[PDB]
Amino acid sequence: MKFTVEREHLLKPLQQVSGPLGGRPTLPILGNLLLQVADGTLSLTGTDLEMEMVARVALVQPHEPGATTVPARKFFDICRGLPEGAEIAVQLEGERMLVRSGRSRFSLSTLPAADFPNLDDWQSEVEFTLPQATMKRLIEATQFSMAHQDVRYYLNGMLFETEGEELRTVATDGHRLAVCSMPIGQSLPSHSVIVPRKGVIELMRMLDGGDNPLRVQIGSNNIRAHVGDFIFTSKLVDGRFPDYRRVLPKNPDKHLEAGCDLLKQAFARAAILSNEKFRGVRLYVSENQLKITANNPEQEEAEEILDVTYSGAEMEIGFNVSYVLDVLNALKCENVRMMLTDSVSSVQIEDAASQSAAYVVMPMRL
């Protein structure tokens, strides 16, 4: 195996394939990157067994086929450490991989490429393409609502659902939920899968914000995403997701509208004096006015009064303020709409000018 490539041509690829790592590398080989030269292309692969990232780099300079694996972080750091514009010559010599550039020489240990975890092939059942910007919007709109390491393991990820020509994402931890739908101009079969939390993060990281479109393939137990010369594959969570449609409040009779910035700031200040652990705050809605209060075990209290658009009956309701702030932070719009029912029902929050995303938060009793 032999190849020579410009440092700048390796940086992005190396950065993208090092992602699968980071976790607890009980197995040494998982700390390595698989390098394969074949048909005039260098392929770099990183994996943690649950997912893998593959990057292909065209070789415009002399090369020889072969494969091996080397310590990921060390190889990446060596390449990044070389000067801008450096030509990196790599050759496999026995049980070591040599990296030479200018008057800098490195000899790295290797592990057989034949021993590198090889994720089995699978068949895609659903496929579609969409702008990177659309995937970014879908994940960013709901990611914060995923559970971390909940016993309800199927919540430690994000639902990706296809229906008609829409692609939708849903995330929930059982107490608050986020859903975002976007039409992608392609007839799709009705299908739903859950992508693991780490997979969602990796998918988001692969979007450079360029024009390169994203091609997605979903199988029975895996999902693959193609962007430019990068291919990310992840196992899917083997479980079923909650009925989010039932979560969305039937027909709320109360409607409140207010500036997103003013509302966020009011809740943020009030939160300061809320219980550090349970974070409860109370809302008092009345004719065109909202009063937010909060108190803690130290008997400290905060009160915010804001002008809002509301003409329904007066009502009081409590909420975990962190859940509310998470939603307002996710909504980068001018005005927000809160749809209420009563003090013992959840609230649905949306951008007042768009129904593309909806947030539902359970109320807190007190």
Added chain:
Amino acid sequence: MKFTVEREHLLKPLQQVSGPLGGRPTLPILGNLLLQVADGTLSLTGTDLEMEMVARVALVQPHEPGATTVPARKFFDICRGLPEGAEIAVQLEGERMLVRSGRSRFSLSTLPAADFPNLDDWQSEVEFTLPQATMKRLIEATQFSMAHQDVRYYLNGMLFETEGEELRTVATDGHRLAVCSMPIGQSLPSHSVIVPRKGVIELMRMLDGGDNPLRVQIGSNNIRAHVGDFIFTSKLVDGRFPDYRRVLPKNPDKHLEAGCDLLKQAFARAAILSNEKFRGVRLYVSENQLKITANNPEQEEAEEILDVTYSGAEMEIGFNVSYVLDVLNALKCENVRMMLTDSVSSVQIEDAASQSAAYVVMPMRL
């Protein structure tokens, strides 16, 4: 106690006095800020018993004398969280302090001002003024060489020494030393004190950069720095700090000069393959050439060859590469000079064009 002031006038002061406070210290009182209204001035004080920060704010609007203490972080967050241009009205009420602005209202818990830790009075023995920029340079030039939780408590701090018309800082952890001297245009007595690590951090944090002069007063067991309307006071560390004069090599005969960036990047790349805990690298000096090598337990190897200016005898010597990189990272000059004597003695590193600072690093066995 009562006062009304523009939010803008409270921002910097609150930030400065909240610094000496950490994540809710052992004693509850230390988590509070002391507020005092007297003679048309609002004074804010924060302390951790070891050091104290006092900020004064002129009160132009109507006020009433008095004192109390309130949760530091909460009061700061409330003020910072209010909108730009907000006016903040504060008044003491029973066991609570009320903060009002617009239609935002807060009631904070209090602790008697009479219980707030009060640093004992002391007498200044050494006094001088100097530009903030000079103090910043003195600290930044040596801070990285201070010890970290060493049992030789005196090494965990920074020596501040006055001699002639110069102020000098010295820092060492017993393995490497850093010394920097700067002229301040004033005749001073020969004196030296040790400022605690935390005190050094706090001192640096109070320096913004403005032409606002820094006034320093040093006592037998205290140091005070006054900048604008901010006064910082800290206890000193009682111990015998080592003499840098006896550490600096005497007429070292082997001088090597090289570009700082090139030398730094060479050591940085070699370091990747050095022992992870011991970090040893070997230097081979010869006519206008430097070779740096590194190897680790798994026999991985790095070699860097650089052109340098050197006409001394050939020699090999080892060093902890982290110590070398720390020095090269602290210097922001174009060229560096390394001065050596033999294989079992320390190296002195300095800006080839300035003797304002000097660094000494102990050698490392093969």
